[PDB]
């Protein structure tokens, strides 16, 4: 019914942790640069909580914020209130990026075609998690080691998966 590619863009740790105290648990600017490169020119779909922590519209991409608040407005951003409204807004898009956080990852989980997932080899203290996924009918199409140096203090890998059927 929807015809834009639904992609998940996420970074998580050994226990699926993605967030702590309404923020990121880790500082990895190189991972952020990979994120910016991959998502450039494509809509970003983010939950209200995810967006507000970010604070600003992210440049070179349609910023779409998901909230139940029927009177929510932010300048230079579009607002959706459901999965379907997002699909309407993105009717003609090539590929959209579900950008988090957990509640929004849950929301769109039945619709994911492609998963860009960064795996961090460390056990962080956290309160927000990426939901479990049945990977049957999923094929790993890409994997590479992330940059570990003095500015990026963890070991991590970029993985990309595509759904077969």
Ligand X SMILES: NC(=O)C1=CN([C@@H]2O[C@H](COP(=O)(O)OP(=O)(O)OC[C@H]3O[C@@H](n4cnc5c(N)ncnc54)[C@H](OP(=O)(O)O)[C@@H]3O)[C@@H](O)[C@H]2O)C=CC1
* Residue list, annotated binding site: 11, 18, 22-23, 48-50, 67-69, 101-104, 111, 113, 128
Please give the annotated binding residues for NADP(+), written as ranges. 11, 18, 23, 48-50, 67-68, 101-104
- C-beta separation of 67 from 81 below 8 A: yes
Q: Give whichever of 70 and 77 is closer to ligand EKB, judged by the CB atom.
A: 77
CA distance 65 to 48: 6
- Closer residue to ligand EKB (CB): 9 or 66: 9
Binding site for a second copy (CB under 8 A): 135-145, 159-162, 164
With CB under 6 A as the contact rule, which of the stretches 94-102, 134-142, 147-155, 156-164 interacts with ligand X? 94-102
For ligand X, the binding residue among 67, 77, 138, 159 (CB under 6 A) is 67
* Among residues 4, 6, 7, 19, the one that binds ligand X under rule CB under 6 A: 19
Task: State whether residue 22 is helix, strand or coil.
Answer: coil
63 binds ligand EKB (CB under 6 A): no
Other Cβ atoms within 10 Å of 32 Cβ, number: 13
Q: Can you tell me the distance from the alpha carbon of 165 to that of 107, in angstroms, rounded to the nearest whole number?
A: 20
Which candidate, 160, 158, 162, 161, places its Cα nearest to that of 118? 158
Who contacts 16 (Cβ-Cβ below 8 Å, separation ≥6)? Answer: 129, 130, 131, 132
DSSP at 146: P
The yes or no reply on residue 82 touching ligand X (CB under 6 A) is yes
Q: Are 115 and 138 in contact (CB under 8 A)?
A: yes
For residue 54, the partner it binds in a second copy, ligand X, ligand EKB, none, with Cβ less than 5 to 8 A by kind, is ligand EKB
- Binding stretches for ligand EKB (CB under 6 A): 9-11, 23-24, 31-32, 35, 50, 53-54, 58, 99-100, 118
């Amino acid at each position: 019914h929807h015809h834009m590619r639904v992609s998940f863009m996420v970074a998580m740790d050994e226990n699926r942790v993605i967030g702590k105290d309404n923020n990121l648990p880790w500082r990895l600017p190189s991972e952020l640069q990979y994120v910016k490169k991959t998502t450039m020119g494509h809509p970003l779909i983010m939950g209200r909580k995810n967006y507000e922590a970010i604070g600003r519209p992210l440049p070179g991409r349609r910023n779409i914020i998901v909230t139940r608040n029927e009177g929510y407005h932010v300048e230079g951003c579009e607002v959706a209130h459901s999965v379907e409204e997002v699909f309407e807004l993105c009717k003609n898009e090539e590929e959209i990026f579900i950008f988090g956080g957990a509640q929004i990852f849950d929301l769109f989980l039945p619709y994911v075609d492609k998963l860009y997932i960064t795996k961090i080899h460390h056990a962080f203290e956290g309160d927000t998690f990426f939901p479990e996924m049945d990977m049957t009918n999923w094929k790993e199409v890409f994997v590479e080691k992330g940059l570990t140096d003095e500015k990026n203090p963890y070991t991590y890998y970029y993985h990309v998966y595509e759904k077969q059927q």
